[PDB]
Amino acid sequence: GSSGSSGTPGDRTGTSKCRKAGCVYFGTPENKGFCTLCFIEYSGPSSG
Ligand SMILES: [Zn+2]
């Protein structure tokens, strides 16, 4: 039950999309641009 949401539902999601290009989710200023998902990977080691 939102008051008047124009865009997409969420709390402290952000206005700009995730820094990454191949990412549908949105990004955040706290995650240095990246989104919740990426933000995690950023720290964790990636392979392939
Ligand atoms: Zn992302």
31 annotated to bind ligand: no
Per the document, the length of the chain is: 48
Q: Tell how far the Cα of 4 is from the centroid of ligand 1, in angstroms.
A: 26
Number of helical H runs and strand E runs in the chain: 1, 0
Residue 32, Ramachandran bin (φ over 0: left; ψ between -120 and 50: alpha; else beta): left
Task: Output helix, strand, coil percentages for the chain, rounded to the nearest 5.
Answer: 15, 5, 80
Let me know if 42 is exposed, middle or buried by CB neighbors in 10 A (0-12, 13-18, 19+): middle
d(CA 45, CA 14): 26
> In which domain, by residue range, is 41 found?
1-48
Q: Method used for this model?
A: NMR
| Number of domains observed in the structure of the chain | 1
Q: Tell how far the Cα of 17 is from the centroid of ligand 1, in angstroms.
A: 8
d(CA 43, CA 16): 21
23 annotated to bind ligand: yes
